[PDB]
Amino acid sequence: KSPLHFAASYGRINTCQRLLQDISDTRLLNEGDL
C-alpha cells in the first residue's frame, strides 16, 4: 500500500516487481492517495 506508493514515486524497480508478484491485485494497484 504505502510502500508501493513510495517505491513507485521514486522509480525503485525491483521493489515494485515483488510488490506486483501478488497477481490479480488491481484494487491497491489503482488505489488513491488522500
Binding site: 510502500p3 521514486y10 522509480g11 525503485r12 524497480i13
Partner: protein
C-alpha cells in the same frame, strides 16, 4: 555588457551542472535499499 555576458555563461554552466547532479541524486533514490524505515 561583457561583464553580465560573462556572468550568463557561468550561470548557464552552473544550472547545467545542477541537472547532472539532480539526475544522479534521483539515481541514488532509485537504487538504495531500506529496511528499518520501511
Amino acid at each position: 555588457e561583457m561583464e553580465i555576458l560573462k556572468q550568463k555563461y557561468r550561470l548557464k554552466d552552473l544550472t547545467f551542472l545542477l541537472e547532472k547532479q539532480h539526475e544522479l541524486i534521483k539515481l541514488i533514490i532509485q537504487k538504495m535499499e531500506i529496511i528499518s524505515e520501511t
